[PDB]
Amino acid sequence: ADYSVIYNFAPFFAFKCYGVSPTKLNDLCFTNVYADSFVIRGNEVSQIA
Amino acid sequence: ADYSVIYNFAPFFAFKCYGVSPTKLNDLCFTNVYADSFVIRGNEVSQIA
Ligand SMILES: *[C@@H]1O[C@H](CO)[C@@H](O)[C@H](O)[C@H]1NC(C)=O
């Protein structure tokens, strides 16, 4: 997993991580990763938390 | 030093201060001030910390 290339795919501003830090994702080793994708409204982004 | 005129020079939103507060900068008296200027990408601003 190379998390330093994600910035080259989408025009977002910054991550928002809860249990870890965005800069420390290149050192830890996990068991499985899951990715969920969808489209919502502008003011409903704060509800994903 | 008058830090209330800085808002009239650049179209930024707000300060981001770490050791002090932006509203209390008119009272303290320092020894020297340094200013560094450059241009970076949009998503690399969060790395200046
Ligand atoms: C720096 O500040 C103004 C904005 O108030 C800018 O338009 C201009 O390039 C500079 N000021 C002058 C007098 O040139």
Curated annotation (Swiss-Prot), chains A, B:
Taxonomy, superkingdom: Viruses
Described function: Attaches the virion to the cell membrane by interacting with host receptor, initiating the infection. The major receptor is host ACE2. When S2/S2' has been cleaved, binding to the receptor triggers direct fusion at the cell membrane. When S2/S2' has not been cleaved, binding to the receptor results in internalization of the virus by endocytosis using host TFRC and GRM2 and leading to fusion of the virion membrane with the host endosomal membrane. Alternatively, may use NRP1/NRP2 and integrin as entry receptors.
Chain positions covered by the region annotation Integrin-binding motif: 41-43
Subunit structure: Binds to host ACE2. RBD also interacts with the N-linked glycan on 'Asn-90' of ACE2. Cleavage of S generates a polybasic C-terminal sequence on S1 that binds to host Neuropilin-1 (NRP1) and Neuropilin-2 (NRP2) receptors. Interacts with host integrin alpha-5/beta-1 (ITGA5:ITGB1) and with ACE2 in complex with integrin alpha-5/beta-1 (ITGA5:ITGB1). May interact via cytoplasmic c-terminus with M protein. May interact (via N-terminus) with host bilirubin and biliverdin, thereby preventing antibody binding to the SARS-CoV-2 spike NTD via an allosteric mechanism.
Section covered of the full-length record: 363 to 411 of 1273
Name this protein carries in UniProt: Spike protein S1
